[PDB]
Amino acid sequence: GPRPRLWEGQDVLARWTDGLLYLGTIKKVDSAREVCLVQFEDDSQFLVLWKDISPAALPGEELLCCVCRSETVVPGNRLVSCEKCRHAYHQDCHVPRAPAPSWVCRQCVFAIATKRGGALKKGPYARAMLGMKLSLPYGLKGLDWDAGHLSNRQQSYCYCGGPGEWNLKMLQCRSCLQWFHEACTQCLSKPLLYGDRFYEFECCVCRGGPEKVRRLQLRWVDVAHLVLYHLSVCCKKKYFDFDREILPFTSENWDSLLLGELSDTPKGERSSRLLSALNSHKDRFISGCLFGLHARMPPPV
Ligand SMILES: [Zn+2]
Ligand SMILES: [Zn+2]
Ligand SMILES: [Zn+2]
Ligand SMILES: [Zn+2]
């Protein structure tokens, strides 16, 4: 082709595994694997799939659909322009179908409403976000999953269609088994722990409406395993000091752990039950006053 969509030196927004957009520069284009090497603002460089890369709208493209690259229009399928990014779309190249020709496209609604800890809950963008989330921008049936239904080949997740790691602040839907980004959800009261599957969750698409979520009751062994796994992933190490790291994390984040029945236990006893859990389950925990996990996987539900 004579006019690639992407090229070296191009400034782009890349969607990361948290569903959020990061400013970057293309350093290498791999047309075979359809990835680019992108350098981000902290100078880190990662491969990013073409589907997750958005360059800026350029002068001269005002009449071009940014999806199918055509200016041609027919009666029931007009061009609509986004007020925020200034890209244009055929009504039918947008998901969901865009209204007849002020309007904001799906990517911009997500860019405005997604937030670490959970998306905006209130206001016009929260409602627009909810409306976008009734539909997926990829086919669920066509995905190829590994045995545990944890990752797919396409790297298509969530309402956004971005990449993702199931153990890194994502929730799985009961009904479709797809995984969804914390940042793209609107139902959480607290940010997710890494690897935390102690929820019942049903997505907007399956419900045809707002998400539904329930935090399951944890046992003390679950608390210990969750905290230790979360720390392992956060800190990228194996062994943690109980007094300098484990217990302080648990104390300082107590209300955010959503511990249900356990949340009322006397403050002077919490250390005892936590440490007892760590000492008693040798199948889960390696002891050193340090503790680590065997083979580093999230707590089983
Ligand atoms: Zn997402
Ligand atoms: Zn189009
Ligand atoms: Zn837009
Ligand atoms: Zn679902």
What's the domain range around 30?
Answer: 10-55
To 5 degrees, how large is the angle CA 40–CA 41–CA 47? Answer: 5
Letter string b/e over residues 30-45, b meaning 16 or more CB atoms within 10 A of that residue's CB: eeeeebbbbeeeeeee
| Distance (Å) from CA 107 to ligand 4 centroid | 20
Answer with the one of 159, 193, 216 that is the final residue of a domain: 216
Ligand nearest the Cα of residue 16 is 1
Q: 25 — phi, psi (to 5°)?
A: -130, 130
Distances (CA, A) of 67 to 33, 54, 88, 90, 163: 19, 11, 9, 8, 19
Same domain, 44 and 61: no
| Distance (Å) from CA 299 to ligand 1 centroid | 23
| Distance (Å) from CA 83 to ligand 3 centroid | 7
| Distance (Å) from CA 25 to ligand 3 centroid | 20
Q: Find tokens 């061009």 and name the residue.
A: 79
| Residue 1 lies inside a defined structural domain of this protein | no
| Residue 2 lies inside a defined structural domain of this protein | no
| Distance (Å) from CA 156 to ligand 1 centroid | 9
- Would you give the distance in Å from CA 92 to the centre of its chain? 26
- CB-CB contact of 169 with 194 (8 Å): yes
3-state SS assignment for residue 23: strand
| Residue 3 lies inside a defined structural domain of this protein | no
CATH number at residue 62: 3.30.40.10
Angle at which helix 106-113 crosses helix 124-132, to 10 degrees, equals 130
Ligand nearest the Cα of residue 128 is 3
Structure letter (DSSP) for residue 105: -
Beta strand residue intervals within 9-149, DSSP E: 11-15, 21-30, 35-40, 45-49, 53-55, 79-81, 88-90
Structure letter (DSSP) for residue 68: T
| Residue 99 lies inside a defined structural domain of this protein | yes
| Distance (Å) from CA 72 to ligand 2 centroid | 8
| Distance (Å) from CA 79 to ligand 3 centroid | 13
Ligand nearest the Cα of residue 208 is 4
Question: What distance in Å separates the CA atoms of residue 259 and residue 273, rounded to the nearest whole number?
Answer: 13
| Residue 277 lies inside a defined structural domain of this protein | yes
Answer with the one of 160, 195, 216 that is the final residue of a domain: 216
Question: What distance in Å separates the CA atoms of residue 104 and residue 88, rounded to the nearest whole number?
Answer: 10
User: Within a 10 A sphere around the Cβ of 285, how many other Cβ atoms?
Assistant: 18
Same domain, 145 and 207: yes
| Distance (Å) from CA 170 to ligand 3 centroid | 25
Answer with the one of 163, 188, 216 that is the final residue of a domain: 216
Same domain, 92 and 110: no
Q: Find tokens 């990013």 and name the residue.
A: 48
Same domain, 157 and 186: yes
3-state SS assignment for residue 176: coil
| Distance (Å) from CA 207 to ligand 4 centroid | 7
Resolution, given in Å to one decimal, reads 1.9
C-alpha Rg value of the chain to the nearest Å: 22
**What single string gives the DSSP state of each residue in 119-174?**
---SSHHHHHHHHHTTS-SS-STT--B-TTS--BTT---TTT-----TTTTEEE-T
| Distance (Å) from CA 240 to ligand 2 centroid | 53
